[PDB]
Write a protein that binds this ligand. Structure first.
Ligand SMILES: [Ca+2]
Length: 251
């Protein structure tokens, strides 16, 4: 073989209707999602997750729903597809609006490393954006030693002037040695596997040698998305996804 990124999973959203149930499941609930978020993430609701016109729209809606004043979708490949290492691309246009918090990210299939699921086993934030600070995209990792609870999370950012007007390929290349974040293949952050350079480094610093699945949502408000409040006029807000593509590196 020639060394190259091999496509192993993708959704080009070339169909019509609900997110393909073979590739996508939903996170459902309005319990705050650990962030005091205001939305109810709905299941297979076309208002919140619809495919058409060559794209997926994850849509945040201001509406009275199951005790919540907003609905949204948190689309996951959990239980459908997960990967250990790879190049992960999500071509998306980000939603606008103070109170919006679109995320493209990953969580571990399993609690391999004790004694909690999170952050012990990690979280790879491929692209995070908050409406009250438009155009700035964050790539971030959370691990037992590096997480937002300890204030020790590791990530970078990059201003994407046309994030909310145009599509941008948000990508990580996650390998045994490091995670690299790209916007349109602008490398704006990388997270080295400290286990390979530091004998005292373990899963607490690099848990990313286990299968992660992809998540895509728009949170409404909560700790980060809504510390400037939630602009109700910012709705409906759309996270529009041209495609999700996952590659594995083959040598
Ligand atoms: Ca597409």
């Amino acid at each position: 073989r020639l060394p190259h990124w091999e496509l192993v999973w993708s959704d080009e959203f070339d169909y019509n209707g609900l997110p393909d149930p073979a590739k996508w499941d939903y996170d459902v609930g309005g319990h705050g999602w650990g962030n005091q978020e205001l939305q109810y993430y709905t299941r297979a609701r076309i208002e919140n997750a619809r495919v058409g016109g060559g794209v997926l729209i994850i849509e945040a809606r201001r509406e009275s729903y199951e005790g919540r004043e907003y609905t949204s979708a948190r689309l996951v490949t959990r239980g459908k597809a997960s990967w250990t290492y790879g190049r992960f691309e999500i071509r998306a246009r980000l939603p606008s609006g103070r109170g919006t918090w679109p995320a493209i990210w990953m969580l571990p299939d399993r609690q391999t490393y004790g004694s909690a699921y999170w952050p012990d086993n990690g979280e790879i934030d491929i692209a995070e954006h908050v409406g009250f600070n438009p155009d700035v995209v964050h790539g971030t990792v959370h691990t037992k030693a590096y997480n937002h609870l300890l204030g020790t999370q590791r990530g970078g950012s990059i201003r994407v002037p046309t994030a909310r007007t145009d599509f941008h390929v948000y990508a990580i290349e996650w390998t045994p040695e490091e995670i690299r974040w790209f916007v349109d293949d602008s490398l704006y952050y990388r997270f080295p596997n400290e286990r390979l350079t530091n004998p005292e480094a373990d899963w607490r610093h690099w848990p990313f040698d286990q299968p992660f699945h992809l998540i895509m949502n728009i949170a409404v408000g909560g700790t980060w998305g809504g510390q400037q409040g939630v602009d109700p006029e910012a709705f409906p807000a759309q996270l529009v996804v041209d495609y999700v593509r996952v590659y594995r590196w083959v040598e």
